């Protein structure tokens, strides 16, 4: 099951729901008046997060959920110095 | 600075922030340390408990001859690498065990076997916020001159190391 | 053994994963369950090249160390009209703002 | 970047805060957009968080006084509650919702330990509960006392009162304080009191064997409702305190008059009725100590009565002797299983009583 995360500039991002939920903020937004039907597709809209930031955020969710040191590949999540402050704001907001 | 109670403080503290990095692997056995690093690249290390009474932390790192283990000694209120290791650096004594690891990681990453300290093995996926921090601390050391909220600048102040 | 993809279309991006040995067809079945569209109405591109339904994702260039979670491999997706497929058109993400002099 | 402060956003934000408080439909885009605004205001505005706390404090007060009016506008006690429970249902529900968007406010000054959620409940206590609470309680107990006399009402009325006492307690190191000292205690007393007169009356009108049938169906319903009305989600074991009460009222004070029918029922092998008696006397401390005697005393008694009465044949054969003891052991173990459900304590009872009969039926004896 997936959820749709839309950026400020109209970009939709579809990620596994359990992955997207590593964020408390998102869980909160999908509750209360943000609650969704039982079989309706979940969709959240961020108004202050651009696509080049929100896409990286989604990458983080996967990076996290599949984190493993016992692999033939040693985990790593490099961030471009030109999108960190904008990503720091996004992470402080999503809380993760 | 050299004092019985002052050294116990400096330690207890530097040992506190150590568990705030993610490279502390608790009571990881030696074989397990070998498993993790066995195939890792030269310079990949991690910190764990020493089954010895004179020192508290051990550094497991991958070298030319494979994974190795070596102390992190504390005396006269300063943290230094193992005695055995022939060290050639402008600085050999630090206050925080984390300050030590950082300095060397910057130098090394940038007499038989060679010894490097480059990539620490994180016990679990760090927070995105922290990775951003680590990323920013690598770019500059002048935080406040940035276009960030006065509070996030505070978050970047609670950890100044590049790893 | 796992390749981390990033399938894209008109301002639509799907972050998902499959086996380096699974086939291109199976990937379309994944896209099917996500965008409710049959495999015969799909066109998967990679570096602007139509992917063969029989080749494994590995035989196409996706590998365990080139398709990592931190940076997924891009896969182009073009749908079908009533007869002819649309042209593979992917929207670019917003550009990253200039780097503050301090961080250079 | 163009600075956006409190005064810049609050005007677009506030309208939603009001809708949330009043439980008026808010669109998902507004829900989301709010989280974003709260966050922005907090990190970008120097005094941003501090103000949002003030603004909320105010707007929460207004709504409450609006509800205060709507509630207190009733003189009649039955309507004062009915009106409270309605305004409560809403507000209490919105307490788990309104705080959500302001979690960044917490870290600058969890949804349960929420400053906002706290400020919500507290402001509601000072304006509506703290005063008309007592009137609600005694008004709620009435509804319960009614249900016991066959009058069914909107159960959500006494519950709303419970939820109020449980959730609206300003005690820093004890949250069920006013729940125990007030609501619980009230429920316990109106209960014990109810039976202190209700029980004895049914005992003198029906049989002591009919009463056990009653004191049982009672303990059953009193425990079923005590589960919906008293606190259970939290850990207090209040439901237990109520039962100990019903048991000390419906059974402990009637044990001697109950156990007086023990030896009689055990003789007519009234397993059905003894099963019932065991079920109850098992709840009271030292409750079955006397049944364990009235049994091993009946065995010894009835056992040697079976032997001596049949001695005419038993004395001639060593096997007609054993058969008699066997017929008995099988007969008593029969009782024990059927009536006393083979309780390990009742088996020990038999095993000791029977083992006694064996050494008292001894007919033959030779010596040097």
Swiss-Prot record, chain A:
User: What pathway annotation does it carry?
Assistant: Protein modification; protein ubiquitination
- For whether the record's keyword set contains Repressor, the answer is no
Places the protein is found: Nucleus
What GO biological process terms are annotated to this protein in UniProt?
positive regulation of transcription elongation by RNA polymerase II; protein ubiquitination; target-directed miRNA degradation; transcription initiation at RNA polymerase II promoter; ubiquitin-dependent protein catabolic process
Q: How is it modified after translation?
A: Ubiquitinated by the DCX(AMBRA1) complex, leading to its degradation by the proteasome.
Key words, A-Z: Nucleus, Transcription, Transcription regulation, Ubl conjugation, Ubl conjugation pathway
Extract the SMART domains matched here: Skp1
Q: Which GO terms describe its cellular component?
A: Cul5-RING ubiquitin ligase complex; cytosol; elongin complex; VCB complex
GO MF annotations, alphabetized: protein-containing complex binding; transcription corepressor binding
What superkingdom heads the lineage? Eukaryota
What InterPro entries does this protein's entry cite? ELC1, SKP1-like, SKP1/BTB/POZ_sf, Skp1_comp_POZ
Fill in the subunit field for this protein.
Heterotrimer of an A (ELOA, ELOA2 or ELOA3P), ELOB and ELOC subunit. The elongin BC complex interacts with EPOP; leading to recruit the elongin BC complex to Polycomb group (PcG) target genes, thereby restricting excessive activity of the PRC2/EED-EZH2 complex.
What family does the entry list? Belongs to the SKP1 family.
Q: What is this protein called?
A: Elongin-C
Swiss-Prot record, chain B:
Biological process terms in GO annotation = cell surface receptor signaling pathway via JAK-STAT; cellular response to hormone stimulus; cytokine-mediated signaling pathway; growth hormone receptor signaling pathway; intracellular signal transduction; lactation; mammary gland alveolus development; negative regulation of apoptotic process
The annotated consequence of residue 62 to R reads: No effect on protein half-life
Q: What induces this protein's gene, according to its Swiss-Prot or TrEMBL record?
A: By a subset of cytokines, including EPO/erythropoietin and CSF2/GM-CSF.
According to its UniProt record, how is this protein modified after translation? Ubiquitinated; mediated by AREL1 and leading to its subsequent proteasomal degradation. Ubiquitination is dependent on its phosphorylation at Ser-27, by PKC. Ubiquitination is stimulated by LPS. Phosphorylation at Ser-27 by PKC facilitates its ubiquitination and proteasomal degradation.
Q: Which residues form the SH2 domain?
A: 23-121
Q: What is the effect of changing residue 71 to L?
A: Decreased ability to bind phosphorylated substrates
In the record, what terms sit under GO molecular function?
A: cytokine receptor binding; growth hormone receptor binding; insulin-like growth factor receptor binding; JAK pathway signal transduction adaptor activity; phosphorylation-dependent protein binding; ubiquitin-like ligase-substrate adaptor activity
Q: What is the effect of changing residue 81 to V?
A: Does not affect ability to bind phosphorylated substrates
Q: How does it assemble?
A: Substrate-recognition component of the ECS(SOCS2) complex, composed of SOCS2, CUL5, ELOB, ELOC and RNF7/RBX2. Interacts with IGF1R. Interacts with DCUN1D1.
Which named protein is this? Suppressor of cytokine signaling 2
Q: Which residues of the full protein are shown?
A: 32 to 198 of 198
UniProtKB/Swiss-Prot annotation, chain C:
Q: Write out the entry's keywords from A to Z.
A: Acetylation, Nucleus, Phosphoprotein, Transcription, Transcription regulation, Ubl conjugation pathway
Supply the Pfam families for this chain: ubiquitin (PF00240)
Domain Ubiquitin-like, by residue range, is 1-79
Q: Could you tell me the superkingdom of the organism this chain comes from?
A: Eukaryota
Q: Where in the cell is it found?
A: Nucleus
SMART domains annotated for this entry?
UBQ (SM00213)
N-acetylmethionine PTM positions read 1
Q: Name one GO biological process term.
A: target-directed miRNA degradation
Output a single Gene Ontology CC term carried by this record.
Cul5-RING ubiquitin ligase complex
Quick check: keyword Acetylation in the entry? yes
InterPro entries found in the cross-reference section: ELOB, Ubiquitin-like_dom, Ubiquitin-like_domsf
**Pathway listed:** Protein modification; protein ubiquitination
Q: Which residues carry this modification: Phosphothreonine?
A: 84
State which residue ranges cross the membrane: none
- From the UniProt record, which GO molecular function terms apply? transcription corepressor binding; ubiquitin protein ligase binding
Q: How does it assemble?
A: Heterotrimer of an A (ELOA, ELOA2 or ELOA3P), ELOB and ELOC subunit. The elongin BC complex interacts with EPOP; leading to recruit the elongin BC complex to Polycomb group (PcG) target genes, thereby restricting excessive activity of the PRC2/EED-EZH2 complex.
> Function of this protein?
SIII, also known as elongin, is a general transcription elongation factor that increases the RNA polymerase II transcription elongation past template-encoded arresting sites. Subunit A is transcriptionally active and its transcription activity is strongly enhanced by binding to the dimeric complex of the SIII regulatory subunits B and C (elongin BC complex).
- Could you say which protein family the record assigns here? Belongs to the Elongin B family.
Q: Report the protein name in the record.
A: Elongin-B
Write the lineage as a comma-separated list. Answer: Eukaryota, Metazoa, Chordata, Craniata, Vertebrata
From Swiss-Prot, chain D:
Q: Does the keyword Glycosyltransferase apply?
A: no
GO MF terms held by the record = calcium channel activity; protein-macromolecule adaptor activity; signaling receptor activity; ubiquitin ligase complex scaffold activity; ubiquitin protein ligase binding; ubiquitin-protein transferase activity
**Where is the PTM Phosphothreonine found along the chain?**
191
The superkingdom listed in its UniProt entry is Eukaryota
Which controlled-vocabulary keywords does the entry list?
A: Host-virus interaction, Isopeptide bond, Nucleus, Phosphoprotein, Receptor, Ubl conjugation, Ubl conjugation pathway
Phosphoserine modification sites are: 25
GO biological process terms held by the UniProt record: ERBB2 signaling pathway; G1/S transition of mitotic cell cycle; intrinsic apoptotic signaling pathway; proteasome-mediated ubiquitin-dependent protein catabolic process; protein K11-linked ubiquitination; protein ubiquitination; reelin-mediated signaling pathway; regulation of neuron migration
Q: What is its main location?
A: nucleus
Substitution effect: residue 46 to A? Strongly impaired interaction with HIV-1 Vif protein
Its annotated compartments are: Nucleus
- Provide GO CC annotations from the record: Cul5-RING ubiquitin ligase complex; cytosol; nucleus; SCF ubiquitin ligase complex; site of DNA damage
Does the record carry Phosphoprotein as a key word?
yes
Please outline how this chain is modified post-translation: Neddylated; which enhances the ubiquitination activity of ECS complexes and prevents binding of the inhibitor CAND1. Deneddylated via its interaction with the COP9 signalosome (CSN).
Assigned protein family: Belongs to the cullin family.
Full protein name: Cullin-5
From the UniProt record, report the name of the gene that encodes this protein: CUL5
């Amino acid at each position: 099951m997936y959820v749709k995360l839309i950026s400020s500039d109209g970009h939709e991002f579809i990620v596994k729901r359990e992955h997207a939920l590593t964020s408390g903020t998102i869980k909160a937004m999908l509750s209360g008046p943000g609650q969704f039907a039982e079989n309706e597709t979940n969709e959240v809209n961020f108004r202050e997060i651009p696509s080049h930031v929100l896409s990286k955020v989604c990458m983080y969710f996967t990076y996290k959920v599949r984190y493993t040191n016992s692999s033939t590949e040693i985990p790593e999540f490099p961030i471009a110095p030109e999108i960190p402050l904008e990503l720091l704001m996004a992470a402080n907001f999503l809380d993760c | 600075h050299m004092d019985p109670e002052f050294q116990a403080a400096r330690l207890a503290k530097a040992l506190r922030e150590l568990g705030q990095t993610g490279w502390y692997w608790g009571s990881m056995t030696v074989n397990e340390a070998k498993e993790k690093l066995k195939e890792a690249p030269e310079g990949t290390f991690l910190i764990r408990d020493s089954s010895h009474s004179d020192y508290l932390l051990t550094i497991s790192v991958k070298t030319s001859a494979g994974p190795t283990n070596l102390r992190i000694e504390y005396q006269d209120g300063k943290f230094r690498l193992d005695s055995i290791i022939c060290v050639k650096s402008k600085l050999k004594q630090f206050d925080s065990v984390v300050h030590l690891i950082d300095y060397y990681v910057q130098m090394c990453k940038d007499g038989t076997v060679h010894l490097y300290l480059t990539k620490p093995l994180y016990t679990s996926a760090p927070s995105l916020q922290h990775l951003c921090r680590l990323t920013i601390n690598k770019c500059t050391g002048a935080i406040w001159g940035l276009p960030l909220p006065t509070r996030l600048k505070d978050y970047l102040e609670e950890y100044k190391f590049q790893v | 053994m796992d390749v981390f993809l990033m399938i894209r279309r008109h301002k639509t991006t799907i972050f998902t994963d499959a086996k380096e040995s699974s086939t291109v067809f199976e990937l379309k079945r994944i896209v099917e369950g996500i965008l409710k569209r049959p495999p015969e109405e799909q066109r998967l591109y990679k570096d602007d090249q139509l992917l063969d339904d029989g080749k494994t994702l590995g035989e196409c260039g996706f590998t365990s160390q080139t398709a990592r979670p931190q940076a997924p491999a891009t896969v182009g997706l073009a749908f079908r009209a009533d007869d002819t497929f649309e042209a593979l058109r992917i929207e670019p993400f917003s550009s990253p703002p200039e780097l503050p002099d301090v961080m250079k | 970047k163009g600075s956006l402060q409190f005064e810049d956003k609050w005007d677009f934000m506030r309208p939603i805060v009001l809708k949330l408080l009043r439980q008026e439909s808010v669109t998902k885009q507004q829900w989301f957009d709010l989280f974003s605004d709260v966050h922005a205001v907090c990190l970008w505005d120097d005094k941003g968080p501090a103000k949002i706390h003030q603004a909320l404090k105010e707007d929460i007060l207004e709504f409450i006084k609006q509800a205060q009016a709507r509630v207190l506008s009733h003189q009649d006690d039955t309507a004062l509650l009915k009106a409270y429970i309605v305004e409560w249902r809403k507000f209490f529900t919105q307490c788990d919702i309104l705080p959500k968007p302001f979690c960044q406010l917490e870290i600058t000054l969890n949804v349960e330990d929420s400053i906002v959620r706290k400020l919500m409940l507290d402001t509601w206590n000072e304006s509506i509960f703290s005063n008309i609470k007592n009137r609600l309680q005694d008004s709620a107990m009435k509804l319960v006392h009614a249900e016991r006399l066959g009058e069914a009402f909107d159960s959500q009325l006494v519950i709303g009162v419970r939820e109020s006492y449980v959730n609206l307690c300003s005690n820093p190191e004890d949250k069920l304080q006013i729940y125990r000292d007030n609501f619980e205690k009230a429920y316990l007393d109106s209960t014990e009191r109810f039976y202190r007169t209700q029980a004895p009356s049914y005992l003198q009108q029906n049989g002591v064997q009919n009463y056990m049938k009653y004191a049982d169906a009672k303990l059953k319903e009193e425990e079923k409702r005590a589960l919906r009305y008293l606190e259970t989600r939290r850990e207090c074991n209040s439901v237990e305190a109520l039962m100990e009460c019903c048991v000390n009222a419906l059974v402990t004070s009637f044990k001697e008059t109950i156990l007086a029918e023990c030896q009689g029922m055990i003789k007519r092998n009234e397993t059905e009725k003894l099963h019932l008696m065991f079920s109850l006397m098992d709840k009271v401390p030292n409750g079955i100590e006397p049944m364990l005697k009235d049994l091993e005393e009946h065995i010894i008694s009835a056992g040697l009565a079976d032997m001596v009465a049949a001695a005419e044949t038993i004395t001639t054969d060593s096997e007609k002797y054993r058969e008699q003891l066997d017929t008995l052991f099988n007969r008593f173990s029969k009782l024990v299983k059927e009536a006393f459900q083979d309780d390990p304590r009742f088996l020990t009872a038999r095993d000791k009583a029977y083992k006694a009969v064996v050494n008292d039926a001894t007919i033959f004896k030779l010596e040097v």
